Design an enzyme around this catalytic site. Structure first.
Site, short mmCIF file in Angstrom:
data_model
loop_
_atom_site.label_atom_id
_atom_site.label_comp_id
_atom_site.label_asym_id
_atom_site.label_seq_id
_atom_site.Cartn_x
_atom_site.Cartn_y
_atom_site.Cartn_z
N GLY A 1 -39.97 42.67 -29.50
CA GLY A 1 -40.45 42.02 -28.32
C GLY A 1 -41.66 42.56 -27.59
N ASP A 2 -41.60 43.78 -27.09
CA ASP A 2 -42.70 44.36 -26.33
C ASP A 2 -43.54 45.40 -27.05
OD1 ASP A 2 -42.27 42.76 -24.25
OD2 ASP A 2 -41.37 44.20 -23.00
MG LIG Z 1 -43.17 39.59 -27.44
MG LIG Z 2 -40.95 42.50 -21.61
MG LIG Z 3 -42.87 40.72 -24.03
#
Ligand SMILES: [Mg+2]
Ligand SMILES: [Mg+2]
Ligand SMILES: [Mg+2]
EC number: 3.1.-.-
Lengths: 152, 152
Positions: free
Chosen positions: A18-19
DNA sequence: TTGTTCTCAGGTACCTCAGCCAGA
DNA sequence: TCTGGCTGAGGTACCTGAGAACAA
């Protein structure tokens, strides 16, 4: 070589998907023989209000740094041996970014060869292109073609 | 009352913590007894090019839907029963959004009480406020404070 | 009177690069 | 010459709401 707990790797792999960022770069270095330096980086980005989460990460991974920019902070790991070790362990669990991780591992593994020859270096530069293609690339500048500077 | 694999839950919690969202809303509605309707959403957002990942989520979770607007997609789950079950299972593995998950679970549980009395409703509204405060809230209009339209 | 589905969009919080410099 | 520590920033891909409508 640290062995990471599986449950940690599973959560991190999700959070990374995700990040997180798995990055390969070709830097123009006039000092370098092939005129370019490779950089491989693992990044985790989070808002600075949450940097403790990143700070903990340095401790759990055991290597790396957190850099801060006003609003947002990043965990960065660039050192090649620790990077190869961490990625080897992470990649089984990645989904979105598994191929990028495998490509990074490949490059590192083939680095020494890559250094002894223009041809081996260019092949390896193509792998970087592949990682960038896989990523959501928006600002890239230097590619394997730019490494036709070697044709001069 | 599906039971979810722990490895899957570990990966997903990390992913949710990164790209995911746990949302509580107070929507103003005239037809409602206290003039507002409460909404709860679990969402995962991703670029539509990666919609395949979210579609997979509907299969794995077994409930919920995927939506597109512009060039990004959202996996969404709002149905309270399935949401309660899923979040009950997810929450132990969440780190960033753990509190929001718990506050949501509590709201759902106190729903029957929320209906009976305004003061009760209002308190449940304050919980929503906590969730939004925990979140990176930027565009929120309707609040527990708005709900003291109950001054009539 | 309630729950849920479906669509939309503000304002970033990420992503993913770029690059310089010290040290061995 | 090479690597690893450090800073800067473009362009979204997320987050986290809003709201209207369908279905009871
Ligand atoms: Mg992402
Ligand atoms: Mg995030
Ligand atoms: Mg993100």
């Amino acid at each position: 070589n640290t062995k990471y707990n599986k449950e940690f790797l599973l959560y991190l792999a999700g959070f990374v998907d995700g990040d997180g960022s798995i990055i390969a770069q070709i830097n123009p270095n006039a000092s370098s023989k092939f005129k370019h330096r490779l950089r491989l980086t693992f990044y985790v980005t989070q808002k600075t209000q949450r940097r403790w989460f990143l700070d903990k990460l340095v401790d759990e991974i055991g290597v790396g740094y957190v850099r801060d920019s006003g609003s947002v902070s990043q965990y960065v790991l660039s050192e090649i041996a620790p990077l190869h070790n961490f990625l080897t362990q992470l990649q089984p669990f990645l989904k979105l970014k598994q191929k990028q991780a495998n490509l990074v591992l490949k490059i590192i593994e083939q680095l020494p060869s890559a250094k002894a020859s223009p041809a081996a270096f260019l092949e390896v530069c193509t792998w970087v292109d592949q990682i960038a293609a896989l990523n959501d690339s928006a600002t890239r500048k230097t590619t394997s073609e730019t490494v036709a500077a070697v044709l001069d």
